[PDB]
Amino acid sequence: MILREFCAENLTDLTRLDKAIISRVELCDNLAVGGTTPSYGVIKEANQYLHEKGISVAVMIRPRGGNFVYNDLELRIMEEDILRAVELESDALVLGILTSNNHIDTEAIEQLLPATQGLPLVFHMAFDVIPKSDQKKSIDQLVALGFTRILLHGSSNGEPIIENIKHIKALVEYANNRIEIMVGGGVTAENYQYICQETGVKQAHGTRIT
């Protein structure tokens, strides 16, 4: 039983979702740039709408597109958006911060931890930018930071996820159930099952997951 997560932009396509197949949705806007934090109205209404249909909501916390190297003002934005996301009863927060050298910016993330108020945390696709050699350590760091899961593609150049099986499986084995691994990027209703059984992953993310 693989857990499927639908990646939505606002609540336009939510009316066809069914908890029987989709258990969670990643709520964001601007998917053209990879997804950003949706408006307050969208978060409040989507959460109530989805909860009503029995589906969890993971809110995207990203101040804009491009880099994952945020300046002070952008971090101030993210902290604010996190406070609202929690007061609006969001089930999870999706974020990702990296240093100029493509490593996990632990200090920046710790600055936002208090605002998270214990809600489940997920590190997004920014994980793939991390050099493959520092990948495993990053997992340990995410575990130490209290993160619940990691959404990754297995590569950063956009190659077919099907060719990242070996690497993704190594990450799952190394994670050793200390944190959940979720596959995303090119994950559809045609390959999500195969990819999961060959890697040991039990969660799939995608805009065309169904």
Next chain:
Amino acid sequence: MILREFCAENLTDLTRLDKAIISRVELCDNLAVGGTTPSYGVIKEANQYLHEKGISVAVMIRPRGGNFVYNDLELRIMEEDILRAVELESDALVLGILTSNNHIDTEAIEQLLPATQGLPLVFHMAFDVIPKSDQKKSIDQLVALGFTRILLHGSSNGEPIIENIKHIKALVEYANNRIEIMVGGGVTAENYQYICQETGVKQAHGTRIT
């Protein structure tokens, strides 16, 4: 002389703005779909940042891309986003609602008027979708609804704004100072001056206005 409005997506490109040339900014996100309501954090920080530099902020109120024919839930989203925009000291609200027959949905707009709490209101590019024959009446309706200005391109098929001079001028003359007309869509630092003098328009909107 001519008032220039910069169309921004979040606050990434705001650091170079100067009140000496840009007096107002239209704040939104997801410009790929024409612009939607930005996150709460972006509105709060952008308003404080821009006000600090002496520039007004018009916040986009649009629950998603595509149509301007909103369902009840989407109208609930817009009312919520309007309440937040005002409590965050926004200077203006940008919205646009149309009926299935491409006419101004007066009843829907009136439902949101109370939440606006008197802030200046602007009707966006959705105005161009209105059949050219019902264009002038729409202006009267916007005046009756208490709107401050209208952002329009002068055509709905995306033709060069330079070819809409005659129509745009007719709208300005008909508006007769009862409401401000602002040009947008293909308006750059190379044609905004010419377009304004030939139409009588005194305000220009654009991502490349400078």
